[PDB]
Structure formats: C-alpha cells, structure tokens
Amino acid sequence: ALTTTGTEQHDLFSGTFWQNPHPAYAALRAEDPVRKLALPDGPVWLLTRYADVREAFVDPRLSKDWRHRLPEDQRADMPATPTPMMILMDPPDHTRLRKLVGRSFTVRRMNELEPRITEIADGLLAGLPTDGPVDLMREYAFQIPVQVICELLGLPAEDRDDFSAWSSVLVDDSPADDKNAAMGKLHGYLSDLLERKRTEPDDALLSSLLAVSDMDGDRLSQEELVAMAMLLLIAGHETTVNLIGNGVLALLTHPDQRKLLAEDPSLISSAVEEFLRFDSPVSQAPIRFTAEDVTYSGVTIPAGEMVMLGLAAANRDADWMPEPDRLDITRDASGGVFFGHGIHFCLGAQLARLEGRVAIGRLFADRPELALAVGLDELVYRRSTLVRGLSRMPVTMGPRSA
Ligand code: HEM
Ligand SMILES: C=C1CC[C@H](O)C/C1=C\C=C1/CCC[C@]2(C)[C@@H]([C@H](C)CCCC(C)(C)O)CC[C@@H]12
Ligand SMILES: [Ca+2]
Ligand SMILES: [Ca+2]
Ligand SMILES: [Ca+2]
Numbered sequence: 001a002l003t004t005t006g007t008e009q010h011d012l013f014s015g016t017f018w019q020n021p022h023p024a025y026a027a028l029r030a031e032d033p034v035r036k037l038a039l040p041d042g043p044v045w046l047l048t049r050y051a052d053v054r055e056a057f058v059d060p061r062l063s064k065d066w067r068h069r070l071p072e073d074q075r076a077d078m079p080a081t082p083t084p085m086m087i088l089m090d091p092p093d094h095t096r097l098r099k100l101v102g103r104s105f106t107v108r109r110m111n112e113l114e115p116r117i118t119e120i121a122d123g124l125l126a127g128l129p130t131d132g133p134v135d136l137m138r139e140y141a142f143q144i145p146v147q148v149i150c151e152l153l154g155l156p157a158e159d160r161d162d163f164s165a166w167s168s169v170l171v172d173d174s175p176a177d178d179k180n181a182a183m184g185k186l187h188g189y190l191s192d193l194l195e196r197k198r199t200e201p202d203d204a205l206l207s208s209l210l211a212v213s214d215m216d217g218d219r220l221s222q223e224e225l226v227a228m229a230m231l232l233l234i235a236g237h238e239t240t241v242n243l244i245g246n247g248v249l250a251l252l253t254h255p256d257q258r259k260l261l262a263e264d265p266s267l268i269s270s271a272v273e274e275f276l277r278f279d280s281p282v283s284q285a286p287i288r289f290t291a292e293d294v295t296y297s298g299v300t301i302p303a304g305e306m307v308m309l310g311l312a313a314a315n316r317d318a319d320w321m322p323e324p325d326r327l328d329i330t331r332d333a334s335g336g337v338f339f340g341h342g343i344h345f346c347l348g349a350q351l352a353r354l355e356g357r358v359a360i361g362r363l364f365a366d367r368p369e370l371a372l373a374v375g376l377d378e379l380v381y382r383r384s385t386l387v388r389g390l391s392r393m394p395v396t397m398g399p400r401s402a
Contacts, residue, residue, distance in 0.1 A: 002038065006031030013039065018381045021283065021388070022325075025313035034299035041176065044287065044306045044385075048313035050320035050337070052296040056309050057285075057341035061294045064088050064344075068289035069304055083183060084224045085231040087286060087344060094343060100212065100220060101228060101347065104205055110350040113148065117358045120147050125366045128397050133373065136393040141244035142237075144359045148351070149236025153229065154197070154204030163189060167237040172384040183230075190229045194222075205232070239281055240352045242389040244359045247275030249379075249393070251364065252372055254327045261329060262368060268361040272353055273333035275360075277315045280338040283388040284308035311337050312388055369398025 002012035008031075010024035011017045017024055028035055028048040035046045047053050056062050064087070067075040081088040086097040124140050134140075146164065150157060166189075169182040194210050201207040206229055213220040220228075251258040251271075261267050288307045293300050301307060314337050316324040339346035346352070363370065373394040380391040 004028055004032060004035075012037065013385065018383055019377075019379075021312065022316060025310065025316065028310070029313060029317055033297045034301065036301075039385075042306070044308055045301050046284065046308050046310050046313075047296055048310040048317075049297060050314040050317035050335075053309045053311065053314040053337050054335070054341055056288070056296065056307075057337070057344075059294065060090070061290060061292050062288040062307060063291040064090050064094070064288060065291070066289055068291045069306070081227075083187070083230065084221070084227040086228070087231060091343070096219070097224060097228065098343070098347070101209070104208065105347055105350065107350065110354055113152075113351070114354060114358065116151070117144070117148055117355060118362065120144055121358050121362045122366075125362060125400075128367075130399055131396055134395050134397055136248065136395045137241070137245055137390050138392070140363065141248065141359065141393070142241045144244065145240035145352075145355055146237055148355060149233060152204060153206050153232060153236070154202045155206075155233065156193070159189070163233060164237055167234045170234055171238040171386050172382050186230050186233070187226060190226050190233070194226065194229070235348055238387060238389075239348070240355045240359075242281035242387055243272070243275060243352060243356045245390045245393055246279040246281055246388065247272065247356060247360050248363065248370075249390070250275055250278055250327055251360070252370070253376065257327050257329050258364070261364060265361060265365060267329050268357045269353070270331065270333065271329035272356045272360065273336065274327065274329045274331055275356070276338040277321070277331075277333070277336050278327050279388060280312040280315050281388060282338065282340075282386060283312040284310055284385055285340060286386060308385065309337070311340075366401055367397045367399075368401055371396050371398065 001014040003009045004012060004024055004027040006027060008023070008027045010027055012024055025048055028046065033047065033049045033052060035048070037044050037046055047056055065080060066082070066088070067078050067080065070078065080093070086094050086101075089097070121144055124143055128134055128139065146160065149155070150160065155163070163186060166182040166186040169178050174182075194206065197207050197210055201211070209220065209225055209228065213222060213225045251261065257271075261271055285308060288309070290301050290303050290305045290307060292303050314320070318324050320335065339349045373396045379393065382389045382391050
C-alpha cells in the first residue's frame with residue numbers, strides 16, 4: 001500500500017487513512033506537497049498546500065477535459081466528457097451551462113427554502129426515539145438534504161431508494177464497471193422522468209429546465225439536461241450529508257465548542273464555516289487533467305496527468321490558518337477551499353450552508369443531551385477519494401428539550 005514519505009509514515013488511501021486522514025495530509029503538506037499516488041486504477045497527483053490548491057483552481061492548465069490524458073492522435077474522435085455535466089467541462093460550454101443554472105440558485109431563492117428545510121428537520125427530530133438505537137447518518141443527516149433535493153428538482157419520493165443507491169456507487173471506491181452501470185440506470189431513470197414531466201410539468205427545477213431546453217436547445221441540449229439533473233441529484237445525496245455528520249461529530253468530540261454553541265445558538269453559521277474547514281466533506285476536488293506541464297512547490301507534473309486538489313488538507317494548512325488543528329467555531333471565517341474556488345465554485349454553497357445550520361442548529365437545540373453510542377474508534381468511514389463521510393453514526397438522542 002501507499003504511505004507518506006519523509007520523517008513520518010502514514011497510510012494513504014488505505015489502512016488507517018479512512019479513519020483519520022489528517023495526520024497523513026499534514027505529512028504530505030510538510031514533506032511531499034505535490035505527491036504522485038500510485039493508485040490501483042492509475043496514478044493520480046495530490047496537491048495539499050493551501051497556496052498551491054487555491055491557485056490551481058484558477059490555472060487553466062489544470063483542465064476538466066479528460067481528453068488531455070490522450071495523445072493528440074486520439075482526442076479528435078472522443079467525446080469531451082463521459083456524461084455532459086458542467087463539472088466535467090471547461091469554458092465555453094462550462095460558462096454557458098453554469099450561467100444557465102446559476103439563474104435558479106439566486107440568493108433570494110435558496111433562503112426562501114428555510115421555512116420548509118426547518119419543517120423537514122423538525123419532523124425528523126420529532127420522529128427520533130429517546131434512547132433506542134439511532135444511526136444519525138441514515139435517519140437524519142442523509143434525510144434532510146435528500147428530501148430538499150427531491151423537492152427542489154421534483155423527484156418522485158417513491159423512487160428514492162432506487163436513485164439513492166445509484167448515487168452512492170458513483171462517489172466511492174466502487175469498481176469502474178459498477179459505476180458505469182449506476183450512471184446508466186440514473187441516465188435512463190432521469191430520461192424517462194423528463195419524458196413524463198413534458199406531459200405533466202410541475203413548478204420544480206427539472207420542469208423549468210426542460211422548458212428552457214425545449215425552447216432553445218443550443219442553450220441546453222437534451223443530453224446536457226439529463227446530465228445536469230444527474231449532477232444535481234448526486235450533489236443532493238452525497239455532500240451536505242457529510243457536513244451534517246462531520247459537524248455533528250466535531251461538536252460531539254469537542255465539549256468546549258458544543259458548550260459555546262449551546263450558550264450562543266447564533267454561532268451556528270460561524271460554526272458551519274468552521275466544520276467545513278476542520279473536516280472538509282469533499283476531501284479532494286474531483287480530478288483535473290494537466291493540459292501542459294505545471295509546476296507547484298518545485299515539482300513539475302507532466303502534461304496528461306490526473307490531479308486532485310486536496311481540500312481537507314489545504315484547509316488545515318498552518319501557513320493559511322493559525323492553529324489549524326484546533327476546532328474554533330468563533331473564528332471569523334474567510335478563504336477556505338471546501339467549496340472550491342473560481343469558475344467551478346460550488347453551485348450549491350448557499351443551499352449546503354443553509355441545510356447545515358438548520359440541521360445541526362435544530363438538532364442540538366432539540367436534543368441537547370445527544371451523545372455517541374459507540375467509541376470514536378468504532379466509527380466506520382466510507383472509502384472514497386471524493387468524500388470524507390461516515391458510513392453510520394450510532395447515537396443516543398436523549399430527551400427532547402422543554
Ligand atoms: C454540502 C457541502 C458541499 C460541498 C462541501 C461541496 C463541494 C464542492 C466543490 C469543492 C466543488 C468544486 C469542484 C471542483 O472544482 O472540482 C463543487 C462544485 C459543484 N457543486 Fe457542490 N458541494 C456541496 C454541496 C452541494 C449541493 C447541495 C449542490 C446542489 C445544487 C451542489 C452542486 C454543485 C455543482 C452543480 C458543482 C459544479 C459547479 C460548476 O462546475 O460550475 N453542491 N462543490
Ligand atoms: C459529490 C460532489 C462533490 C462536488 C460537487 O458538489 C458535486 C459532487 C458530485 C457529483 C459528481 C462529482 C464529480 C464527478 C462525478 C462523480 C461524476 C462522474 C465523474 C461521472 C462518470 C462516472 C464513470 C465512472 C461512469 O465514468 C458523476 C457525478 C459527479
Ligand atoms: Ca421514529
Ligand atoms: Ca408551471
Ligand atoms: Ca501565510
């Protein structure tokens with residue numbers, strides 16, 4: 001397996017890394033900040049220093065076009081993406097699609113969801129038992145964002161078990177064959193769903209976008225439309241859930257910070273920025289491809305290579321954040337690469353922040369005796385190069401606040 005070089009040897013993307021990657025990240029930052037990882041599916045580079053990561057995000061030599069892996073001899077015949085999602089594109093197609101969908105994630109729009117998000121969270125909390133076993137992931141942290149995304153897009157509730165399964169395979173260490181099958185089922189499901197929406201539209205996002213596409217197919221093609229729906233669905237299942245989980249765990253493991261939040265519940269939005277920094281839910285940005293040689297921290301990555309920007313790593317870089325290993329919900333947050341940076345900056349950043357503060361804020365308000373029901377060392381994490389996420393979180397809710 002892989003380990004960090006230098007003065008300290010820590011497992012990388014195997015072994016102890018899944019439980020707690022943060023020591024490994026620190027050893028990478030200190031001693032190997034531009035690291036080639038000889039992973040099973042092929043080598044991937046990893047940048048972990050904050051200044052390198054932040055600038056890389058605006059370096060066009062680090063492209064989303066996967067054809068850069070190929071010699072020029074082979075790029076001509078090949079599609080620009082495996083699925084035409086904007087996160088897998090460079091400008092101009094990225095610019096067009098982002099501008100288009102960005103129109104539905106305007107500042108007033110997401111906030112007008114607060115009342116419903118709160119009702120969803122409050123309903124979930126009222127349904128949780130006082131001391132029987134609760135997996136806080138499946139029963140709360142997962143449920144809030146999935147319900148919100150289903151309502152925002154107009155996804156049938158009856159189909160949730162099917163598409164939640166396809167979604168999870170795409171984001172973890174599942175075999176390439178399995179991922180290809182999952183994407184196929186999701187593409188088919190959403191294609192069929194859009195066909196049905198044409199005949200009976202609703203007021204939710206997928207109908208609105210289908211209408212745009214119907215009116216002007218050069219602004220949004222049918223295939224782009226399905227790929228957008230797929231991207232938004234998967235983001236709705238696999239991101240915010242781990243802000244909730246990781247943030248809850250941070251409070252559970254830091255009584256001092258939990259006490260500060262209990263004493264000033266209004267710290268919750270500052271607290272959310274701090275959870276995003278301290279245990280970033282998107283651990284490595286999805287892959288970029290070197291379109292030419294690039295040099296970071298004295299290390300040249302050749303053209304044609306795959307590159308992850310290490311967000312969890314960079315957000316604990318002491319060169320950027322003093323005492324980066326300290327959880328401090330009172331920090332006046334600024335910078336931070338947990339939502340990315342530049343043209344692909346998280347489309348859902350406002351929505352995730354709102355979901356996060358509602359879910360975590362209301363949970364601790366409703367159940368101020370919440371506690372883990374296992375030791376910290378018994379917690380199981382997902383194996384993924386994309387997400388830092390608990391597989392389950394055994395808790396005891398304790399009594400509802402009076
Ligand atoms: C919950 C915490 C979330 C985190 C930590 C997060 C993280 C990120 C990051 C790091 C990127 C940039 C990736 C890169 O440049 O390679 C990104 C982009 C993106 N995110 Fe989020 N995300 C979250 C929630 C969401 C939600 C709720 C949505 C639903 C709308 C969403 C939709 C998107 C989309 C569509 C992009 C692609 C944007 C573009 O290419 O222009 N995200 N996210
Ligand atoms: C969770 C997050 C974190 C970052 C954003 O919020 C959006 C998001 C997920 C959805 C993603 C992540 C980037 C690339 C993904 C994983 C796509 C794959 C590259 C599609 C091709 C899959 C395969 C293996 C069939 O060839 C499918 C859904 C996309
Ligand atoms: Ca119940
Ligand atoms: Ca309508
Ligand atoms: Ca500095």
